[PDB]
């Protein structure tokens, strides 16, 4: 503290007296990151684990709102396999919630899961369901026999 008074006052000969020099602070060693519980859960059982759905032309839209979506437990535990995603990381997907989400229930073949992609042509791509180039989401496909 003798040269704490000397360096802040900017003189090499210090006058005898009381002086205020700097401020003290404490650094936090832990940041508490807290998320809510299940609360109002979104109806993800009807779009995934349900019995029978529509066709590839006959597909229905479902706009899911006013709940809390759980993305990360389908990727982390993973009974479902394939995802290849462009423009938004699944972790980032978790990161930027979108005012809306759409889910379309259909079923295709195993050579046709390559054809669902932005910026391609094909059977399901040209004549049935086309993804635009600015589309912000990606394809999850799995085998259920």
């Amino acid at each position: 503290p003798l040269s704490e008074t000397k360096c802040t006052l900017k003189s090499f000969t210090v006058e005898k007296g009381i002086y205020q020099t700097s401020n003290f602070r404490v650094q936090p060693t832990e940041s508490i990151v807290r998320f809510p519980n299940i609360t109002n859960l979104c109806p993800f059982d009807e779009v995934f684990n349900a019995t029978r759905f529509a066709s590839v032309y006959a597909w229905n839209r479902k706009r899911i709102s006013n709940c809390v979506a759980d993305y990360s437990v389908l990727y982390n535990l993973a009974p479902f396999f394939t995802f290849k995603c462009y423009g938004v990381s699944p972790t980032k997907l978790n990161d930027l919630c979108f005012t809306n989400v759409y889910a379309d229930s259909f079923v295709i073949r195993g050579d046709e899961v390559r054809q669902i992609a932005p910026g391609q042509t094909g059977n399901i791509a040209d004549y049935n369901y086309k993804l635009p180039d600015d589309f912000t989401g990606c394809v999850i496909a799995w085998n259920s026999n």
Partner: protein, 313 residues
């Protein structure tokens, strides 16, 4: 005196972010002039409380046995039985007179307990020592001849003094009982005590309300300027907030220097009547109160001295 508040350069300007403290160095240092002015303020309230509250360096003691000839001096003298040392009037002066961002209140070097024992010895000098306690080494003059020095300055023959002495005994101590009944009911006479503290309270309240003000930018919070958008285009947004805060601080420091100047000019006149009509007889008209002057009794109060003036009407 006044309530001393000192703002800080780090916690008040910055919202606890590491990009705020790195951008304080491109202004140079504007808060080092704020530190040496406010410590230059804080040596001035360490200045004027020394000579006004302590005129002399010695302490005189009242005698424990009191027969004054029909004069009650005990209501302005402090009570030894109460563990805080205060008198009867000064208990009524205390109770009727009534942050986390880096705004702190610096205490002075004198608490409110020991101001009343500065004035206990100075009222002991007006009773036991007369006019000679601030004159150098005091003399023992009792109270019947302490008045005879003061009535000879206004030219009064003492034949009215000794005869009417029992008749002026009843009207003297009831006059302090008039102002004891006045301060127990009407709180409007303490408005010259409390005018300094509420203006300093709203000076703190005008440090509150600009932290929700956007200063022409998008938001007042420093966290969502850097995080949400591009720090190329947040560099225009950040540097006029601190400029918008320091233009509120430079009109804050100039209004607290004139409140330091208004307690500089008033303590010139508060030490003038402490010099004139406390330590001796003041021969002038309408300074120490309206009339021909007799006695002046200081009392202890927060942020001021309450005077009791005995005048001839």
């Amino acid at each position: 005196s006044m309530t001393k508040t000192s703002v800080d350069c780090t916690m008040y300007i910055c919202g606890d972010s590491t990009e705020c403290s790195n951008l304080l160095l491109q202004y140079g240092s504007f808060c080092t002039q704020l530190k040496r002015a406010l410590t230059g303020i804080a040596v001035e309230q360490d200045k004027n409380t020394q000579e006004v509250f302590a005129q002399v360096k010695q302490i005189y003691k009242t005698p424990p046995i009191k027969y004054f000839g029909g004069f009650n001096f005990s209501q302005i003298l402090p009570d030894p039985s109460k563990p805080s040392k205060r008198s009867f009037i000064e208990d009524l002066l205390f109770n009727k007179v009534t942050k986390f961002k880096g705004l702190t209140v610096l205490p002075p070097l004198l608490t409110d307990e020991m101001i009343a024992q500065y004035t206990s010895a100075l009222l002991a000098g007006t009773i036991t020592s007369g006019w000679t306690f601030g004159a150098g080494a005091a003399l023992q003059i009792p109270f019947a001849m302490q008045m005879a020095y003061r009535f000879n300055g206004i030219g009064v023959t003492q034949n009215v003094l000794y005869e009417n002495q029992k008749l002026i005994a009843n009207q003297f101590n009831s006059a302090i009982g008039k102002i004891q009944d006045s301060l127990s009911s009407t709180a409007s006479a303490l408005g010259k005590l409390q005018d300094v503290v509420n203006h300093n309270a709203q000076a703190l309240n005008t440090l509150v309300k600009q932290l929700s003000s956007k200063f022409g930018a998008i938001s007042s919070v420093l966290n969502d300027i850097f995080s949400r958008l591009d720090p190329p285009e947040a560099e225009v947004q950040i540097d006029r907030l601190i400029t918008g805060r320091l233009q509120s601080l430079q009109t804050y420091v100039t209004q607290q220097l004139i409140r330091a100047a208004e307690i500089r000019a008033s303590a010139n006149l508060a030490a003038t009547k402490m010099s004139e009509c406390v330590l001796g007889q003041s021969k002038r008209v309408d300074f120490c109160g309206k009339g021909y002057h007799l006695m002046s009794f200081p009392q202890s109060a927060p942020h001021g001295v309450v005077f009791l003036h005995v005048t001839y009407v």
